[PDB]
Design a protein around this ligand. Structure first.
Ligand code: HEM
Length: 353
């Protein structure tokens, strides 16, 4: 439901969604059947207010899925996996991620144009980086990726002999405290939803840079803009458009209005990142980005350090190795997935150079 929160015009907001945002950053939505009262959180500040509040849970209205947990059990599991995303860990991983990116751009430059960038480059790249971060053994990566019992069997086996990566760390440091199913669940979230979001950022972000050739070249002239460019790209794309509802556990005042106990709040990251026409233009020279593309609060994207590193490496290397890159069809013909709660993405991206 609430399909209006996902209406777009290519990468931008649809007029119907812009009109909704004019009703304020916090919109009360009583259901027509009188079964519940829902809320739309559409503004940057209000979305952060909701997501930072302790007075909401993620009740429904799979083991190892942090998004389906509330404190204290959410805290318990997240604290065990968080060290895998430390700065020290990303620094040690960076050169290997660079090499994986180079592997896939090697394949791309050798196949010669054209290429379907989503299936042939972005997808495999994201899945291979995920395998490296997780520490998947080499002989299991091909099958694990093809699959996008096996997971439980894989998790139990790697749990017996801890290796490298996040999965080895967790099992090595929290062997008895995490089960096979929970480990498998941590792996699945990384290999499934996470790759979907990352691959979409890679493909749609490449399209976004191609539609702004001045900045495509600027990122090549000044690769130090990579970190800034990533923040602007994830803000502009908002591939994770809307969040699971947050239900108020008690009466709480948000954005000047009282959200009653039991009412559900739907945060629109898309609206929060894009509704403000001031400072909405795509501009990678912006030194600081105002966005909630990775969420906020206790459920803030645990993989943001990896996503930010991988995307920086990918975009900077791409613009450098393919200065002549261009869409093989007019940009206006690219197909985007119709409105849905699923990750936002294009369906294919034919490129040549
Ligand atoms: C490297 C790949 C990624 C991995 C492994 C990853 C893993 C996660 C995990 C495990 C959570 C749940 C945290 C919790 O509930 O405590 C999470 C939350 C989130 N991730 Fe990431 N993520 C990754 C890349 C992204 C990307 C590319 C985006 C979009 C730009 C993204 C947008 C989010 C959002 C919006 C949430 C919060 C959902 C909510 O609060 O309801 N993630 N991510």
């Amino acid at each position: 439901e609430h399909r209006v929160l996902h209406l777009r015009d290519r990468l931008d907001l649809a007029a119907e969604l812009k009109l909704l945002c004019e009703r304020g950053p916090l919109v009360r939505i009583p259901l027509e059947d009188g079964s519940a009262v829902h809320w739309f959180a559409l503004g940057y500040d209000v979305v952060r207010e909701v997501l930072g509040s302790e007075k909401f849970d993620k009740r429904v209205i799979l083991p190892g899925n942090l998004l389906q947990l509330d404190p204290p059990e959410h805290t318990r599991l997240r604290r065990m996996v968080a060290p895998a995303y430390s700065v020290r860990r990303m620094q040690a991983l960076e050169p290997r991620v660079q090499a994986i990116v180079d592997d896939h751009l090697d394949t791309m430059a050798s196949t010669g144009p054209p290429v379907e960038f989503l299936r042939e480059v972005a997808g495999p790249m994201a899945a291979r980086v995920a395998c490296e971060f997780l520490g998947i053994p080499l002989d299991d990566r091909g099958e694990l990726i093809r699959l996008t019992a096996y997971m439980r069997e894989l998790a139990a086996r790697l749990r017996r002999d801890p290796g490298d990566g996040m999965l080895g760390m967790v099992a090595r440091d929290h062997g008895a405290d995490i089960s096979d199913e929970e480990l498998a669940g941590l792996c699945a979230v990384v290999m499934n939803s996470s790759v979907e979001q990352t691959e979409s950022c890679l493909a749609a972000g490449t399209l976004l840079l191609l539609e702004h050739p001045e900045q495509f070249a600027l990122l090549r002239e000044r690769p130090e803009l990579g970190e800034q460019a990533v923040e602007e790209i994830v803000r502009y794309l908002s591939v994770f458009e809307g969040l699971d509802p947050r239900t108020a556990t008690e009466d709480v005042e948000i954005g000047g209005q009282v959200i009653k106990k039991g009412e559900a709040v739907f945060c629109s990251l898309l609206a929060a990142n894009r509704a403000d026409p001031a400072l909405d233009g795509f501009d990678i020279t912006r030194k600081e980005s105002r966005h909630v593309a990775f969420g906020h609060g206790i459920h803030h994207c645990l993989g943001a350090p990896l996503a930010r590193m991988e995307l920086r490496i990918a975009f900077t290397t791409l613009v450098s190795r393919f200065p002549s890159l261009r869409t093989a069809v007019p940009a206006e013909e690219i197909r985007f997935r119709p409105p849905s709660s699923n990750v936002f993405t294009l369906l294919e991206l034919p490129l040549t150079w």
